[PDB]
């Protein structure tokens, strides 16, 4: 599930 | 001269009060003259006797013939003495809480000239409570007497805190407001934004002046054609945007900053971009606002126009930081960057001769502008990415030199702080590792040695983007490779249990790819 | 810090993983989220950062079946969709 998860935060890191 | 003045004198004291009413009339029209106004002035028993009256008297008409009386004395060098020394300030400044408008005309007007022309009547109007009565009748509406009025507080507040915090605590900051808001004469919106500028130097003035609204007031008069009226209003303006970046009603004064950046003026230019960046740093509609009118576009022009002047660039980089971040309307404004072709000179102000603080905003603008896939390759063509690494390399082994085990000597350098370098510089390399050209690039470079560094680093966000960018380039299998071999399993597996749960995120993520 | 309110579509989707409030951080909005993707366990395995959400409530609070986790400006777009910002 670690590959999904990476790839969420490269999500939310648009946001910081 | 001396031959009715001592029965003149011994007639306003008197214990009838119609006695010294008939005394007060024919003493105004005698004042109306330069000798028989001489007289009176070289009578220092005359003229505590009409301030005296003026003072304490309940009839109307002696009240204004005594206020007119000293009027008509405050036309002259010794007139002002004999008024100062007669105790005729702390009288005026009582006739200032009078409900005649003729009375007040009299009475503001002679302070006025004493303030003017008279050496020590700052601070007896101010011991006498000047100040506060004259903020007082702020809420009048006749436009000569609030000239008089706002320009005598001007004279007073002058490089003066105590009498700011004074015109602060008795309401002064929301007066000064509504007067910009609501009337059209130059000369007492020119006066009243020298009493706000004046103000606004002083920063526990400037929340109330926001609150009351004087953004927007004085944005009201930036197309005003006296540009005295407009500098001052600009002035206060930059002065006041740090407070207070929750202001709604905003839409006119933004559209009309915009618009001010393309000004021939350049020190127009340069308050427009400051006002704006600091209007922009934490707020998602002045965002979506500044865009909207063409911020971006008319943001790219001025640092295009700027060349190598910081003052200009950096407030407006900064501006654009902003602007390309954390709106509905950022992936438009990235793009529009590129589109008006700013992304080249973007990556010069990268170079010398740039300071620290435009290098740090500048980067900070460049990691926002990477979020936009159409700009991966041309930041790459740019040389964004060589520049960020030696901007990244000087400032982690700057850090180093000051870290032993004491932990790190915290200093900054031109206002900067170098992990502060560090902290965007990686944080950019990380958005642009998304590409696999830039990936290419950057390994290229010997950096996954010096990205493995930052992991021990204690400070949060760079341990994050450290992190962050070493999982981008694990996902190609020959890097993954590389990163194993400088020794990254041990840090990343206690980074596993971050209180920054990201960081966890992009360990594991690094981990799954060097050995399966 | 900017503060949101989400749409009563979007407010059950949250408070389905246990959220609290009715205004929110991007932060929190992008938390729960993506908890409730990796719960409902929408994600392929083949591919990880693909999203089929077809008869999930997901693709009724988004529209389409299935995105994919990397296409960031279609997400915040649906996102921003669903939010009203403080
Ligand atoms: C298996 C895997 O590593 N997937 C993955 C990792 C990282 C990212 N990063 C971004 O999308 C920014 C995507 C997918």
New binding site residues.
Partial sequence: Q???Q??W???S?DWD | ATRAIPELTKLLNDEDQVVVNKAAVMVHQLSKKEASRHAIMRSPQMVSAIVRTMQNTNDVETARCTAGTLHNLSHHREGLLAIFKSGGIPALVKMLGSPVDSVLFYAITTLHNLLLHQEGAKMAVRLAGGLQKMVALLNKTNVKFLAITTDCLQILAYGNQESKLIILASGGPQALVNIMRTYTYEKLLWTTSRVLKVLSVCSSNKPAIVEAGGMQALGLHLTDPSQRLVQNCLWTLRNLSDAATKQEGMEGLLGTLVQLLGSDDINVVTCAAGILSNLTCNNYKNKMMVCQVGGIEALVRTVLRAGDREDITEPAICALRHLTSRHQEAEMAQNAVRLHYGLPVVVKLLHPPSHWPLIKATVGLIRNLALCPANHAPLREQGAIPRLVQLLVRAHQDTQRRTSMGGTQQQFVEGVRMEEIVEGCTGALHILA?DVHNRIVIRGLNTIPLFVQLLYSPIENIQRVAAGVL??L??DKEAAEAIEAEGATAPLTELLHSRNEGVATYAA?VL??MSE | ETLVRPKPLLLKLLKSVGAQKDTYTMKEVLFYLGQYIMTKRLYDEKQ??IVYCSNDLLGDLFGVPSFS??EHRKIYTMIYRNLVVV
Wanted: hydrophobic fraction near 40%.
């Fill in positions: 670690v590959c999904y990476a790839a935060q490269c999500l890191d | 998304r999982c981008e694990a996902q993520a799954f790819r | 990880q950062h986790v990397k």
